[PDB]
Design a binder for this molecule. Structure first.
Ligand SMILES: C=C1C[C@]23C[C@@]1(O)CC[C@H]2[C@@]12C=C[C@H](O)[C@@](C)(C(=O)O1)[C@H]2[C@@H]3C(=O)O
Lengths: 438, 137, 334, 111
């Protein structure tokens, strides 16, 4: 059992390990008294630190080297925002009360308020009313859209670089590697990983890639097209390459037999998935079948990037309330971004997300977001122990938020061996890595 | 003991080990290119560096270089020519550091005016070269 | 060997861990390892669900400088369901309501309002004093040396004084108590000076081990040097990082009673509650500050604890914490 | 008569400047422009403030020239990183970030 007075302060120290931790602190104090400035500089710049909360392990590393929560942020607004939120909360309860007569007037009422309103609240009100408008009537481009989300918002670049570091660290010491991308999309994560293996000390391995994509008449060959361009890059840096595309309606339609896996000792396997597992919660039993296949693959790492929110509640106005706060923060972050066609197409990308969130039901609704606490419960029951992220990944994400984003207030924080990207103090997304429990 | 004869024809005498500092001379003396004044300057430089070869002395030699480098534009041009011709690493490096310090100057008008360099950029190319290096401006 | 018998083991572990981490994070040429400092910092997030009678929410006070504050309020006893977004800025019911404006310590370089040690302190202040707290997130040194914190405090105070939902029904006014810890005490003193200069009427001032110094070496610095978690070397490092270029430790931001400073005679100042630790490396400076308050014609209640080190208020396992909290509650509800 | 310097002499002179000075002189004239694009000068500039990376200069030079070169590596990402910390020396993670950005840009512009 931990020390409650210290666990409140953010440190997981056993009550029976106090003496050992104090003794190691004494030993560390003496060592830094002896080794002095050069040793301290070594400890600062040549070390990667993992899980600062566990004091025992952090001190051991230093010694061995020297030898439901509702987070809300209120931005400046006007009372018309309160009137808008009052109108928005009026229609959601009226449409939930089976009124369907006051809702038509209330939906019209929201429209008249939005025009007077100015700022980011006008955009959120317009998109929520439209999804509220044609929810009433239900009881009575894509490739360029995800592209426009890359050069405007920092969530995709954060997801790629932070997951690459976890995969890169687990691949050291291996001669043949194989990565499976559940979110292949257009292969924007992998060009950066291939170069890092080229400059790896000891020699690059044989890199094999296998992508899985949603069905389409063109996406069957679009995945083939993607591997055509990645094969051209793997030869300019002298890396052995291999590729194989997939077409599948849902990740639940997969099995380990058709992935064509060599023995894991011969080829190391790393599974990747970015913004994909939340689309699987609409199908009953989907998430349990996929997580039973990843265990069948027996990889060395499985990196998951998701959205930090609770948008999968069993009560409609509960989902409506949380989603309105979360998408209010997102539209507040984009308020200062200079106006561009990438920015315009980014809101349409998110507008389609709002609209599917409240208007649809059953398998048609795919935006079943969950928090890391809920996500960690699913992975833990499968048998996936956490793999902690270090300060090297933290540093790159912090400098990433400094090249493209300058004045916007994005921050990175560490929690439970994970990394979070948020606006000021409000978390938005989380990156976690997992390994089979032994 | 070796005699080098320059464009002036005067047989400047210098010690063999001192003359060995020039790789071209060591490998092979009409010397039709190097003028008498520049040959004298290279002889002085080689003599001083041989005395140094045969810190407080390091900084004294450095300030002596600083004093010797104080020469006009044509003299620096000829020194670069002679250093490249006679394959002397130290003299070429010193004159190069001097000109590099000189070109650590202002906007391109200043560089093109002090060196009398005449640019003929076609305005598409002038503007494009200005934009492609906009980070510096 | 000497600090082990004066504090409990958990407090010793916490302070020693902080000291060794800050030792690692300090570089001799005057630069700070910001990325590793932020990676090692333990933080929390705001929660609108009342836990133990307290709930919190963040407010973006300023966007140009990214100035933020966290508001702690007692749970609405009249209602049963948890508060909504509109219920957050609900007017207070009560004849008199005091609001505490808190500044956190860290020697102008460490910690934040989101830290797990100052969030706990603010929640305990709300629970014990029966008030509302506003915790400011000011800029830090050496990236933002001076006077960035003294401007963040002024902006936060100007914001707090304007909240129509924080007014009291007795006189249609807001009753503000400035509170500071460590360097927060320094910020509190300077912000109280600025508020007294202007029309804002601060009623009280609370200082917990305020950070003041000087050129000369007092007897506590010589006698107590490295004995209890603090050395003069890192004190001088932090003063060098915070202060402007080409200035000594006699700058008024370091010593308020320097000849270059300003006189506190004929000056309206709030009543002060100064808590001075005994086993502190800079105890003499704090006692001199209290004496300079007493001899300037102002009011001050000095609380000198003989066997108190730094950070006694971060854990509720000592008598000093209980005595100080009782005195703060009596000072506030007066 | 520095106005009619040949390529080798211009390169010799320009080995002793920094990024600002080289990118400044690159707008002097056409021959200065041609000599300023040289890969060796920009490799020297990029490696000048690194002082800590190691994998072998051959591998790094080959990879960086395959993906766009050192001039792009400096202009696009290295200079913005050096803008707020002019005195700081880039270590290991800065190279990892910058080369990853170069790889991404090469893949995007490939089609
Ligand atoms: C370098 C420092 C900073 C200390 C004193 C110390 O010498 C070592 C311990 C630091 C500290 C740790 C956490 C708190 O933020 C602090 C105010 C405290 O009480 O103790 C911190 C305190 C301080 O801010 O003065």
């Amino acid at each position: 059992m931990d020390d409650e007075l210290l666990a409140v302060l953010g440190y997981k120290v056993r009550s029976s390990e106090m003496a050992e931790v104090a003794l190691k602190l004494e030993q560390l104090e003496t060592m830094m008294s002896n080794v002095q400035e050069d040793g301290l500089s070594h400890l600062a710049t040549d070390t990667v630190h993992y899980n600062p909360s566990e004091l025992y392990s952090w001190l051991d590393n230093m010694l061995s080297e020297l030898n439901s929560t509702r987070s809300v942020i209120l931005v400046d607004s006007q009372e018309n925002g309160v009137r808008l939120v009052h109108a928005l909360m009026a229609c959601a309860e009226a449409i939930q009360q089976n009124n369907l007569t006051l809702a038509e007037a209330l939906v019209k009422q929201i429209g008249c308020l939005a025009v007077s309103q100015a700022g980011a609240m006008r955009k959120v009100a317009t998109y929520f009313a439209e999804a509220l408008a044609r929810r009433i009537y239900r009881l009575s481009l894509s490739d360029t859209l995800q592209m426009h989300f890359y050069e405007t918002c920092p969530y995709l670049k954060f997801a790629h670089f932070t997951a690459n570091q976890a995969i890169l660290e687990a691949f050291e010491g291996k001669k043949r590697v194989h990565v499976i991308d559940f979110s292949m999309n257009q292969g924007l994560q992998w060009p950066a990983l291939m170069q890092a293996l080229a400059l790896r000390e000891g020699g690059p391995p044989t890199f094999r890639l296998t992508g899985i994509g949603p069905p389409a008449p063109d996406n069957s060959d679009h995945l083939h097209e993607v591997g055509c361009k990645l094969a051209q890059l793997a030869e300019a840096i002298h890396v052995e390459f291999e590729y194989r595309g997939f077409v599948a309606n849902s990740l639940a339609d997969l099995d380990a037999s058709m992935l064509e896996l060599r023995p894991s000792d011969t080829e190391a396997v790393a599974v990747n998935s970015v913004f994909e597992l939340h689309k699987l919660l609409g199908r009953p039993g989907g998430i349990e079948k996929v997580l039973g296949v990843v265990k069948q693959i027996k990889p060395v790492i499985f990196t998951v990037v998701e959205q930090e929110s609770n948008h999968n509640g069993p009560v409609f106005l509960d989902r409506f309330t949380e989603s309105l706060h979360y998408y209010s923060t997102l539209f507040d972050s984009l308020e200062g971004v200079p106006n561009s066609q990438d920015k315009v197409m980014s809101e349409v990308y998110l507008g389609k997300q709002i609209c599917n969130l409240v208007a649809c039901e059953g398998p048609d609704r795919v935006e079943r977001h969950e928090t890391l606490s809920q996500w960690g419960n699913r992975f833990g029951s499968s048998g996936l122990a956490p793999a902690h992220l270090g300060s090297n990944a933290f540093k790159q994400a912090s400098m990433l938020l400094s090249v493209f984003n300058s004045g916007q207030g994005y921050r990175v924080e560490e929690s439970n061996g994970c990394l979070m990207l948020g606006w000021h103090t409000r978390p938005l997304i989380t990156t976690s890595a997992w390994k089979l429990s032994t | 003991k070796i005699t080098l004869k320059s464009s002036d024809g005067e047989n400047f005498e210098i010690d063999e080990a001192v003359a060995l500092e020039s790789q071209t001379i060591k490998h092979m003396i009409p010397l039709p290119n190097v003028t008498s004044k520049i040959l004298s300057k290279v002889i002085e430089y080689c003599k001083r560096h041989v005395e140094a070869a045969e810190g407080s002395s390091d900084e004294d030699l450095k300030t002596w270089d600083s004093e010797f480098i104080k020469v006009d534009q044509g003299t620096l041009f000829d020194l670069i020519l002679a250093a490249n011709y006679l394959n002397i690493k130290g003299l070429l490096d010193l004159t190069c550091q001097t000109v590099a310090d000189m070109i650590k100057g202002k906007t391109p008008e200043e560089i093109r005016k002090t060196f009398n360099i005449k640019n003929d950029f076609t305005p598409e190319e002038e503007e494009e070269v200005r934009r492609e290096n906009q980070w510096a401006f | 060997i000497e600090s082990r018998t004066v504090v409990p083991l958990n407090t010793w572990v916490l302070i020693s861990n902080f000291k060794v981490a800050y030792n690692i994070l300090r570089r001799p040429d005057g630069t700070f390892n910001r990325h590793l400092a932020e990676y090692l910092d333990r933080k929390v997030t705001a929660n609108a669900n009342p836990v133990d009678g307290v709930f919190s929410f963040d407010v973006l006070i300023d966007r140009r400088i990214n100035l933020l504050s966290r508001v702690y309020r007692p749970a609405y006893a009249d209602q049963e369901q948890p508060p909504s977004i509109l219920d957050l800025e609900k007017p207070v019911d009560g004849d008199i309501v005091p609001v505490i404006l808190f500044f956190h310590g860290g020697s102008f370089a460490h910690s934040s309002a989101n830290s797990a040690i100052y969030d706990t302190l603010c929640r305990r202040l709300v629970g014990l004093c029966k008030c509302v707290v506003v915790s400011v997130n000011y800029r830090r040194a050496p990236e933002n040396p001076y006077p960035c914190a003294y401007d963040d405090g002024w902006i936060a105070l100007n914001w707090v004084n304007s909240r129509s939902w924080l007014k009291s029904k007795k006189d249609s006014k807001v009753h503000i108590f400035l509170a500071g810890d460590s360097s927060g005490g320094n910020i509190a003193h300077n912000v109280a000076l600025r508020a007294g200069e202007s029309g804002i009427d601060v009623l009280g001032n609370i200082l917990l081990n305020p950070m003041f110094g000087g050129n000369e070496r007092t007897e506590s610095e010589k006698s107590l040097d490295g004995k209890y978690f603090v050395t003069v070397r890192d004190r001088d490092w932090y003063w060098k990082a915070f202060l402007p270029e080409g200035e000594d430790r006699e700058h008024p931001a370091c010593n308020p009673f320097s000849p270059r400073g300003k006189s506190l005679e004929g000056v309206s100042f709030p009543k002060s509650l100064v808590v001075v630790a005994g086993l502190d490396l800079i105890r003499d400076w704090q006692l001199a500050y209290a004496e300079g308050l007493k001899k300037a014609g102002q009011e001050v209640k000095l609380m000198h604890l003989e066997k108190a080190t730094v950070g006694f208020y971060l854990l509720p396992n000592n008598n000093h914490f209980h005595n100080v909290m009782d005195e703060i509650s009596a000072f506030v509800n007066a | 008569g520095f106005s009619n310097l040949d390529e080798n002499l211009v390169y010799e002179v320009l080995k002793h400047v920094d990024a600002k000075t080289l990118a400044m002189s690159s707008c002097v004239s056409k021959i200065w422009h041609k000599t300023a694009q040289d890969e060796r000068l920009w490799e020297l500039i990029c490696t000048r403030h690194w002082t800590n990376i190691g994998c072998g200069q051959n591998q790094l030079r080959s990879v960086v020239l395959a993906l766009g070169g050192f001039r792009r590596l400096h202009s696009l990402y290295l200079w913005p990183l050096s803008k707020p910390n002019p005195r700081a020396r880039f270590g290991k993670d800065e190279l990892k970030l910058t080369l990853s950005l170069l790889s991404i840009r090469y893949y995007e512009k490939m089609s």
